Structure 1
Amino acid sequence: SDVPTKLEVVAATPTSLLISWDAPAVTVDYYVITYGETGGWSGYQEFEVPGSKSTATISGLSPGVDYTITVYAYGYPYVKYNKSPISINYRT
């Protein structure tokens, strides 16, 4: 039910994460990734990744903190296709 799929932390230190995901078959314009402390009502950061790529590095994180990380395929037909952006939580 998610697009992209298989959002994973590939490698981690206490202040950075390398994330990967599996792109949809349909070409994506670019991706937007948000990340922020789980449970926060605000604070979340955002950045862009080209549509040809399916990894990113998130840096400048705090050790021991549970982050909610979400990847959006910008302009993808989520509503038409009945999909949602993919999200995971990862601590530290």
Structure 2
Amino acid sequence: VSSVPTKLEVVAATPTSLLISWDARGEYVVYYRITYGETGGNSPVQEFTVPGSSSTATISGLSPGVDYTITVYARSYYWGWYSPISINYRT
């Protein structure tokens, strides 16, 4: 009965891959799934996954300049998901 991991930011990349450093005020029960896609709607989704107050990580960002959109995921109390939040800002 809540909302998301409620910050956003991707400051820079390493214009191949990318640092994604967002909110995690503690955890909850604890867990983050992070989505992994362009916004093409083609090239399938993929999965990063992290622990503690750590949504504050960095992708393996394979492909070049192409628009990339990417969500993090709370997981709590209920082994379900508190909410998600996403931004799309690519290379």
Bin of the TM-score, shorter chain as denominator length:
0.7 to 0.9
In structure 2, what is the equivalent of residue 56 of structure 1? 57
Relative to structure 1, the CA distance from residue 51 to residue 13 in structure 2 (aligned partners, 3 Å threshold; closer, same or farther) is same
| Gap regions ≥5 residues in structure 2 | none
Partner residue in 1 for 2:36: 35
- Seq. identity, %: 82
Q: Deviations over 1:36-61 (max 9, x none)?
A: 11031551111210033231110242
Residues 12 and 42 of structure 1: CA distance in aligned 2, closer, same or farther (over 3 Å): closer
- 2:89 maps to 90
Instruction: Give the structure with the larger helix fraction.
Output: 1
1:80 is matched with none
Give the unaligned 5+ runs of structure 1.
Answer: 78-82
Report the counterpart of residue 5 of structure 1 in structure 2: 6
Give the structure with the larger strand fraction.
1
- With normalisation by structure 2, the TM-score equals 0.77
Post-superposition offset of 1:30: 0.7
> If the length of structure 1 is used for normalisation, what is the TM-score?
0.76
